[PDB]
Amino acid sequence: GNFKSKLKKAMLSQQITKSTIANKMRLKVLSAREQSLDGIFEETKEKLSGIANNRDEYKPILQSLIVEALLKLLEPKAIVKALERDVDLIESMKDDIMREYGEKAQRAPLEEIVISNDYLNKDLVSGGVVVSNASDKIEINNTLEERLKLLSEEALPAIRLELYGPSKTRKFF
Amino acid sequence: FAINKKAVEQGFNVKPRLNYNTVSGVNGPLVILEKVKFPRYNEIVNLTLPDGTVRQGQVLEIRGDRAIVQVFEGTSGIDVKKTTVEFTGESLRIPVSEDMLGRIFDGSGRPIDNGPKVFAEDYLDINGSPINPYARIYPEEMISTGVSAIDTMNSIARGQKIPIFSASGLPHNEIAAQICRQAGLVREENFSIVFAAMGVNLETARFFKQDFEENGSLERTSLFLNLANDPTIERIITPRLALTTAEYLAYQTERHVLTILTDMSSYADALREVSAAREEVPGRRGYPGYMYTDLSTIYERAGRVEGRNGSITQIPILTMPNDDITHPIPDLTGYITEGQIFVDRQLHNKGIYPPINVLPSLSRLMKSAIGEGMTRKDHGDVSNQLYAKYAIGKDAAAMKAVVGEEALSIEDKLSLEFLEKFEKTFITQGAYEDRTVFESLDQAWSLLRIYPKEMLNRISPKILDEFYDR
Amino acid sequence: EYGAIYSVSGPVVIAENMIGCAMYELVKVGHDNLVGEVIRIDGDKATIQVYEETAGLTVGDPVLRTGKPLSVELGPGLMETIYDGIQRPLKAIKEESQSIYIPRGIDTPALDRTIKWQFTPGKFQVGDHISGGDIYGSVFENSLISSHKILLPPRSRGTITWIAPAGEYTLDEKILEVEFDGKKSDFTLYHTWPVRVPRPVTEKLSADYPLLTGQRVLDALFPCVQGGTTCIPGAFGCGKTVISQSLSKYSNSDAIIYVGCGERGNEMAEVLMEFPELYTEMSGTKEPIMKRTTLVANTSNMPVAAREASIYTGITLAEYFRDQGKNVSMIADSSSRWAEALREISGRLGEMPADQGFPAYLGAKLASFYERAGKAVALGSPDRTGSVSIVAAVSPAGGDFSDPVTTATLGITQVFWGLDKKLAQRKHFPSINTSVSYSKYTNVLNKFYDSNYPEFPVLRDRMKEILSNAEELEQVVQLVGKSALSDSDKITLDVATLIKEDFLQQNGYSTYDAFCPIWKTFDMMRAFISYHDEAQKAVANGANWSKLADSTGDVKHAVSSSKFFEPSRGEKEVHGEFEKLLSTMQERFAESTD
Amino acid sequence: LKEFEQKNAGGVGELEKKAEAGVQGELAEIKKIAEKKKDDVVKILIETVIKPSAEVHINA
């Protein structure tokens, strides 16, 4: 009977080993998939960094981003912090910012805009802006890298459906 | 393809989120914000303590421009000058996919098996929505658990919700392991398992893991583990995640799920814990009034539906505090669920395994389960006669112990012998001793033959004529 | 015009800029127009209880008004369908959405607006004078209900100026115009009514006709009159579902309105697919039962608030059917759930509690709800008569009978059917505690009994005293034994066990043991009493009961098996069989005792 | 018993190589499909992230 128990536990051990092997193989496959997806994400960062080195295209993009931040914020005053290259056009087209604000935020046109003497870790960012109210207590981190990272959590189903075909098992979407 | 794609095209909808810095109050497990712009009831926020750690939480109340955020992982160490709250803008949701099988998740559903993040197919709100009764079908097929005490007098149908009452210090874990190991149908093996344990000791978790390893079933199941050391508030989340995954699998992949919760007592305790944190009206024994509704929400995800071939089955495990049925937890659980299987002490004290009594056990779906196309007609009458004779034997034993052996009529001694043989042979079975319904019932017939034929009342004459003789 | 949300707490919502709002006025809230019900008013703000899930609501959402209270749409088509707690058809929702869940904020008409009805005019002609509650034509609805009377809504009166002719119409047509001071009146096949206001009635009456249930013990010892109320406590294991289903099935009511307030839900599917093939022969024959019912389902999973309005809707529909002159019989499923919902709402609202946390007005609410039941004479010219008989089923928490809700109910109801747990555990399925359970319509029913069965009342008391004496001797025999027992006591105990095993056991699965007419039970209990009386007479004349019983033998088996007679065989063939059995039993006692 | 242990002791490498060869085609197929449909996804992501969307909270 003891020998029977010993052979039983030997069978248990070998079955455990083979199950572990199968689990490890599956984990390896999933890790490879995830690594490939992360590599795909990687390219977008460098593409955005390259795009961020052309003033003609960059200007409308930055203007639109700051306009979106202001529209969501909905405050009479605001503070924006980044490299201050475009204070002239910004605060002059801030007439256009007021105009579009009254077009959409028809309650009134924006009161003013203030550029902080602080800047960003441009080694860690590739443009964009951070917008905060006058009291400097409500912020909308809206840089390019931040936007890409944020989008990297909602496109996963779409990314899957695009890279691969629809899950043949799924029957009701 | 296009139909599926149109349901996902809205993914590319980046939306910036604003993070405040006006935390203006804290006490107990609650945090109070101020000057928040257009709150949204029951959404998710991500705090960031001054040391960089981030905890999660959801708003529970919305006054005029101020939300009472509730934190999961305690509140100690929260600063008022440096903390930064952030809003996701949407309710709590989790990723899902058929690849979750064979993976282990913590209480919050993040992987803990060294694997990568789930390559999600889509996100789903944890809370779910009710099912209109008109789109519901009650089951009519019997599962064969191999346990005679169950598969004889308390059958299980694919779609039922049968809790297993229990008391601390009894082998309910072994019973659950045996059931999952012998979950075959009367007659592939699509029985995925979504075991989700909350508030349990380490040894129980490791034992369950090893049991799943040995049977070559881990690759067919997913684990939601939440040990005691984890925060209490987070406890009330795990069962909802488990049920969400189970229903996704069973209603969008045509699988046959089999979920086995455990220690609902700990879940109720967590409800009491963060219910007395606030000052809501107490029910009985300090329990919340709306625990009945909450437990109904948890339990009422079961049965089959109109179109989907998939099914689902719940086997939650309870832990009666002091071996009292009249405790509110078992009271409400019985009020909701459809019959239950019980466990006693003395039987366990008598070395009888599985220590299952049957007198207080009940199962409603037996009527639809038993019949002709699945079993012999005798099935129901045999069980009824066993109940009657067992009860008579119990009462006769009590009376004999009271007075003596002089007043015990011949029938009384026959009942005592029947009770002894029943509890000593019919119930006892090994840790790996299967019993299909046919052989179990055949063995059961042996015990009744001790009785003279005529006295048998609750059994129709045809069954006696066609079966008793053999 | 509009209002903005100001604060949210689960099911309670507080709005602002709400000035013209009244109390209990219906309102729609949210961008999906969720239904609510204003409760308390404080300046601009007014508390609202929401009748659906409140997740993701945001401050600043517009709030609307309707200016009218909660109401339910009556008329043809109500019947044979299934509705949720707030009068929404369920099959239509599933079909339209092609889903399995309930989409929040979905709206559909209460009654189908497409089908057409073969209408027939009544007996009134232009220029006549009419008042609220008078019929002005019938409508064909079903083979089981050929005539679906249409009515002039109460509080509406005048003289008819134009009427429609016979033909086929949809319930949107204006088939009648009433000329009051002005001609501002039009009436289609349907109308509405506020639920919280009981429908008027000419006058109440005294109910003196038994409500047959098909259950032996219920019909024998605790009869229920057609027009009264009852209560059925339990301990979540007593299996009270059996009697509810049996009385909903085989009772002699013209219509029944099953309502589920906080149920397991699966039972709704059970009844849904079980009824469609179970025929009744009250009119003609073979008509399936499902053409005789209306289901108001609200599973415990669905929002808490709707559990409140569900029972009001059910009772209002029952009153409407009663007004046609048909003896409807509503039956609830769980009143305790309603009390739990009320307690939860009260506690969340932040108000001082009462006994065991419940509010203080629950007793008054329960009394007012129960008062609506009762036989009465309709309001109108034809002078038809109807009746309602509600059957609640309370469910205590600890399984005892001391919780506030049960105590409040027992002070209102007049029939008490308590359910024990141990008897159910013994599979003695109609497990009714015959010690505490009591009835009150016993004396009044004598008017029916003497006409139909003069001897029944004395015999029921005979059995009652027999059972009481057996229960009085059980403890003494247990504490001492049969050593100090006389023959008569042993006879009493044996007959008590015989009754408990034969006249009190039933099973709604055997063909013969599914429905016991009055005559069958009458004859069976007659035979039981005669057997006991003959045994007592013989033993008094002198004989060892131990010797006598063995000789008696087969007659005991015959009386035990008497219940196996097929019901509805001839109704007189069975009478002759009972007569012959009694005669042979008497002869046996004449000789076997000798 | 020792013979039984040795029987499957040497087979550990056998099963290792068996499974290893069992999963090689899928591993390279993943790389191939990733190469095939890479640029388009990057273009879509860039277009989405770069594209703004004027909006305002509706209740305002």
Phi, psi of C323 (to 5 degrees): -60, -25
CA torsion, ordered C253, C255, C258, C259, to nearest 10 deg: -120
Can you tell me which residue has the tokens 């344990």? B197
| Residues on chain D touching A6 (C-beta within 8 angstroms) | 1
Residue B408, exposed/middle/buried by CB under 10 A (0-12, 13-18, 19+)?
Answer: middle
For testing contact with chain B, the best of D40, D48, D50 (most B CBs within 10 A): D48
Same domain, C132 and C15: no
Rounded CA-CA distance A67/D54 in Å is 8
| Residues on chain A touching D1 (C-beta within 8 angstroms) | 3, 6-7, 10
Cα C119 versus chain centre, distance: 31
Q: Do A163 and D37 touch (CB under 8 A)?
A: yes
Q: Which residue of chain D comes nearest to A154, CA vs CA?
A: D45
Q: Give the three-class secondary structure for C113.
A: coil
Which amino acid appears at position C451 of this protein?
S
Question: How far does chain B reach from its first CA to its final CA, in angstroms?
Answer: 62
DSSP state letter for C292? G
Instruction: List, in sequence order, the alpha helices (H) in C543-572.
Output: 545-552, 554-561
Q: Give the three-class secondary structure for C575.
A: helix
Q: Which residues contact B117 (CB under 8 A, 6 or more apart)?
A: A34, B95, B110, B111
Q: Which residue of chain B comes nearest to A172, CA vs CA?
A: B252
The count of other CB atoms within 10 Å of the CB of residue B261 is: 24
Question: Are the beta carbons of C388 and C319 closer than 8 angstroms?
Answer: yes
Q: Do A160 and B119 touch (CB under 8 A)?
A: yes
SS (H, E, C) chain A: CHHHHHHHHHHHHHHHHHHHHHHHHHHHHHHHHHHHHHHHHHHHHHHHHHHCCCHHHHHHHHHHHHHHHHHHHCCCCCEEECCCCCHHHHHHHHHHHHHHHHHHCCCCCCCCCEECCCCCCCCCCCCCEEEECCCCCEEEEECHHHHHHHHCCCCHHHHHHHHCCCCCCCCCC
- Give CB contacts under 8 A, 24+ apart, made by C313-316: C313/C72, C313/C83, C313/C85, C313/C86, C313/C87, C313/C195, C313/C259, C314/C257, C314/C259, C315/C369, C315/C372, C315/C390, C316/C72, C316/C193, C316/C195, C316/C199
Which amino acid appears at position B174 of this protein?
E
Structure tokens at C131: 């008042």
CATH number at residue A112: 3.30.2320.30
Cα C217 versus chain centre, distance: 18
Q: Does B62 touch chain C (CB under 8 A)?
A: yes
Domain that holds residue A89: 47-157
Give chain D's length.
60
Question: Are the beta carbons of A48 and A57 closer than 8 angstroms?
Answer: no
Question: Are the beta carbons of A155 and B11 closer than 8 angstroms?
Answer: yes
Q: How far apart are the CA of A30 and the nearest CA of chain D, in angstroms?
A: 10
Q: Give the three-class secondary structure for C61.
A: coil
Q: What single string gives the DSSP state of each residue in chain D?
A: -HHHHHHHHTHHHHHHHHHHHHSSHHHHHHHHHHHHTSHHHHHHHHHHHH-------TT-
Structure tokens at C293: 């019912």
Instruction: List, in sequence order, the alpha helices (H) in C171-303.
Output: 216-221, 241-250, 266-274
For testing contact with chain B, the best of C83, C240, C301, C400 (most B CBs within 10 A): C301
Geometric angle at alpha carbon B178, from B177 and B179, rounded to 5°: 90
Structure tokens at C183: 């001609």
Cα B17 versus chain centre, distance: 38
Q: Which residue of chain B comes nearest to C13, CA vs CA?
A: B62
Same domain, C91 and C220: yes
Q: Does C60 touch chain D (CB under 8 A)?
A: yes
Rounded CA-CA distance C42/C494 in Å is 70
Rounded CA-CA distance B309/B180 in Å is 21
Structure tokens at B219: 């690759």
Phi, psi of C157 (to 5 degrees): -150, 160
Q: Which residue of chain B comes nearest to C104, CA vs CA?
A: B129
Same domain, C556 and C493: yes
Q: How far apart are the CA of B14 and the nearest CA of chain D, in angstroms?
A: 7
User: Is the four-CA dihedral B315, B317, B323, B328 of positive or negative sign?
Assistant: negative
Q: Give chain A's radius of gyration (CA, Å).
A: 27
Q: Give the three-class secondary structure for C194.
A: strand
Rounded CA-CA distance C297/C307 in Å is 10
Q: Do A161 and B119 touch (CB under 8 A)?
A: no
Strand partners, A79: A114, A132
Exposure on the CB side of residue C417, measured as CA atoms within 13 A: 24
The helix, strand and coil proportions of chain C, stated in percent and rounded to the nearest 5, come to 35, 20, 45
Rounded CA-CA distance C494/C489 in Å is 9
* Residue B259 Rama label (left phi>0; alpha psi -120 to 50; beta): beta
Q: In what order do the strands lie in the sheet with B85-86?
A: A114-115, A79-81, A129-132, A138-142, B19-20, B85-86
Rounded CA-CA distance B196/B222 in Å is 8
Phi, psi of B145 (to 5 degrees): -85, -10
Rounded CA-CA distance C222/C216 in Å is 10
Cα C210 versus chain centre, distance: 15
Q: Does B289 touch chain C (CB under 8 A)?
A: yes
Rounded CA-CA distance B18/A142 in Å is 9
User: Is the four-CA dihedral C463, C465, C466, C468 of positive or negative sign?
Assistant: positive
Same domain, C297 and C366: yes
Which amino acid appears at position B116 of this protein?
P
Residue C501, exposed/middle/buried by CB under 10 A (0-12, 13-18, 19+)?
Answer: middle
- What separation in angstroms does the CA of B67 have from each of C7, C16, C36, C401, D50? 10, 18, 23, 43, 33
Rounded CA-CA distance B244/B96 in Å is 9
| Residues on chain D touching B37 (C-beta within 8 angstroms) | 57
Question: Are the beta carbons of B310 and B246 closer than 8 angstroms?
Answer: no
Q: Give the three-class secondary structure for C460.
A: helix
Which amino acid appears at position A33 of this protein?
R
Same domain, C415 and C545: no
Same domain, C167 and C202: no
Residue C274, exposed/middle/buried by CB under 10 A (0-12, 13-18, 19+)?
Answer: middle
Question: Are the beta carbons of C208 and C445 closer than 8 angstroms?
Answer: yes
Same domain, C259 and C388: yes
Rounded CA-CA distance B385/B397 in Å is 18
Q: Does B269 touch chain C (CB under 8 A)?
A: no
Q: Which of B12, B14, B38 faces D59 most closely, judged by CB atoms?
A: B38
Cα C393 versus chain centre, distance: 9
| Residues on chain B touching A138 (C-beta within 8 angstroms) | 18-22, 35, 37
Give chain C's length.
594
The count of other CB atoms within 10 Å of the CB of residue C267 is: 22
* B 38-57 residues with CB < 8 A to D: 38
Q: Does D60 touch chain B (CB under 8 A)?
A: yes
Question: Are the beta carbons of C378 and C320 closer than 8 angstroms?
Answer: no
The two counts, helices (H) then strands (E), for chain C are: 16, 22
SS (H, E, C) chain B: CHHHHHCCHHHCCCCCCCEECCCCCEECCEEECCCCCCCECCCEEECCCCCCCCCEEEEEEEECCEEEEEECCCCCCCCCCCCCEEECCCCCEEEECHHHCCCEECCCCCECCCCCCCCCCEEEECCCCCECHHHEECCCCEECCCCHHHHHHCCEECCCECCECCECCCCHHHHHHHHHHCCCECCCCCEEECCEEEEECHHHHHHHHHHHHHCCCHHHECEEEEECCCCCHHHHHHHHHHHHHHHHHHHHCCCEEEECEECHHHHHHHHHHHHHCCCCCECCCCCECCHHHHHHHHHCCCCEECCCCCECCECCECCECCCCCCCHHHHHHHHHCCCEECCCCHHHHCCCCCCCCCCCCECCCHHHHCCCCCCCCHHHHHHHHHHHHHHHHHHHHHHHHHHCCCCCCHHHHHHHHHHHHHHHHHCCCCCCCCCCHHHHHHHHHHHHCCCCCCCCCCCCHHHHHHHHCC
Structure tokens at B354: 């599985």
Task: Tell whether residue B272 is among the known ligand binding residues.
Answer: no
Geometric angle at alpha carbon C293, from C291 and C297, rounded to 5°: 130
Rounded CA-CA distance B456/B414 in Å is 13
Q: How far apart are the CA of B204 and the nearest CA of chain C, in angstroms?
A: 31
**Strand B196-200 relative to strand B223-227: parallel, antiparallel, unpaired?**
parallel
**Strand B44-46 relative to strand B19-20: parallel, antiparallel, unpaired?**
unpaired
Geometric angle at alpha carbon B145, from B144 and B148, rounded to 5°: 100
Structure tokens at B25: 């109050």
Chain D neighbours, 3+ Cβ pairs < 8 A = A, B, C
Q: Give chain B's radius of gyration (CA, Å).
A: 26
Rounded CA-CA distance B432/C197 in Å is 65
Q: Give the three-class secondary structure for C192.
A: strand
Same domain, C64 and C176: no
Which amino acid appears at position B465 of this protein?
D
**Strand B93-96 relative to strand B122-125: parallel, antiparallel, unpaired?**
antiparallel
* B 113-152 residues with CB < 8 A to C: 127, 129-138
Q: Which residues contact B350 (CB under 8 A, 6 or more apart)?
A: B423
User: How many structural domains comprise chain C?
Assistant: 4
The count of other CB atoms within 10 Å of the CB of residue B67 is: 25
Structure tokens at A10: 């030997």
If we measure between CA atoms, which residue out of B417, B224, B430, B199 comes closest to residue B318? B199
Same domain, C136 and C203: no
Q: Give the three-class secondary structure for C458.
A: helix
Same domain, C138 and C97: no
Question: Are the beta carbons of C232 and C335 closer than 8 angstroms?
Answer: no
For testing contact with chain D, the best of A4, A7, A30, A44 (most D CBs within 10 A): A44
If we measure between CA atoms, which residue out of C53, C44, C56 comes closest to residue C17? C44
Q: Which residue of chain B comes nearest to A170, CA vs CA?
A: B253
Q: Which residues contact C250 (CB under 8 A, 6 or more apart)?
A: C213, C214, C514, C515
Q: Does A7 touch chain D (CB under 8 A)?
A: yes
| Residues on chain A touching D45 (C-beta within 8 angstroms) | 41, 44, 148, 151, 155
Q: How far apart are the CA of C2 and the nearest CA of chain D, in angstroms?
A: 13
Phi, psi of C274 (to 5 degrees): -95, -45
Interface size between B and C, measured as CB pairs under 8 A = 152
Q: Give the three-class secondary structure for C433.
A: coil
Rounded CA-CA distance B343/B354 in Å is 9
In chain A, breaks (C-N over 2.5 A) are found after none
Residue C107, exposed/middle/buried by CB under 10 A (0-12, 13-18, 19+)?
Answer: exposed
Q: Given in angstroms, what resolution was this structure solved at?
A: 3.8
Question: Are the beta carbons of C242 and C429 closer than 8 angstroms?
Answer: yes
Rounded CA-CA distance C378/C152 in Å is 13
Same domain, C463 and C401: no
Question: Are the beta carbons of C49 and C9 closer than 8 angstroms?
Answer: no
Q: How far apart are the CA of B234 and the nearest CA of chain A, in angstroms?
A: 23
Question: Are the beta carbons of B387 and C426 closer than 8 angstroms?
Answer: yes
Cα C532 versus chain centre, distance: 37
Q: How far apart are the CA of D48 and the nearest CA of chain B, in angstroms?
A: 6
Rounded CA-CA distance C319/C193 in Å is 11
In chain B, breaks (C-N over 2.5 A) are found after 187
End position of a domain, from candidates C439, C472, C505:
C439
The count of other CB atoms within 10 Å of the CB of residue A130 is: 19
Experimental method: cryo-EM
Q: Do B38 and D44 touch (CB under 8 A)?
A: no
- Burial string for C331-349 (b: 16+ CB within 10 Å, else e) reads bbbbbbbbbbbbbbbbbbe
If we measure between CA atoms, which residue out of C121, C97, C232, C123 comes closest to residue C173? C121
Which amino acid appears at position D58 of this protein?
I
Rounded CA-CA distance A73/A69 in Å is 6
| Residues on chain D touching C6 (C-beta within 8 angstroms) | none
Q: Give the three-class secondary structure for C325.
A: coil
Which amino acid appears at position C65 of this protein?
R
Q: Which residues contact D26 (CB under 8 A, 6 or more apart)?
A: A29
Question: Are the beta carbons of B127 and B240 closer than 8 angstroms?
Answer: yes
Structure tokens at A158: 């779409």
If we measure between CA atoms, which residue out of B106, B163, B128 comes closest to residue B317? B163
H or E segment and range at residue C379:
none
Question: Are the beta carbons of B246 and B312 closer than 8 angstroms?
Answer: yes
Q: Which residues contact C137 (CB under 8 A, 6 or more apart)?
A: C119, C120, C121, C122, C150, C175
| Residues on chain D touching C58 (C-beta within 8 angstroms) | 59
Structure tokens at C276: 């469609």
Question: Are the beta carbons of C155 and C193 closer than 8 angstroms?
Answer: no
The count of other CB atoms within 10 Å of the CB of residue C435 is: 11
Question: Are the beta carbons of A169 and A113 closer than 8 angstroms?
Answer: no
- What separation in angstroms does the CA of A78 have from each of A110, A115, A143, D58? 9, 9, 17, 21
Domain that holds residue C153: 115-187
Q: Do D48 and B12 touch (CB under 8 A)?
A: yes
Q: Give the three-class secondary structure for C271.
A: helix
Q: Do B218 and A72 touch (CB under 8 A)?
A: no
* D 36-55 residues with CB < 8 A to B: 44-45, 48-49
Rounded CA-CA distance B382/A29 in Å is 54
**Strand C287-288 relative to strand C279-280: parallel, antiparallel, unpaired?**
antiparallel
Q: Which residues contact B110 (CB under 8 A, 6 or more apart)?
A: B117
Rounded CA-CA distance B211/B218 in Å is 9
DSSP state letter for C485? -
Structure tokens at A109: 């046109």
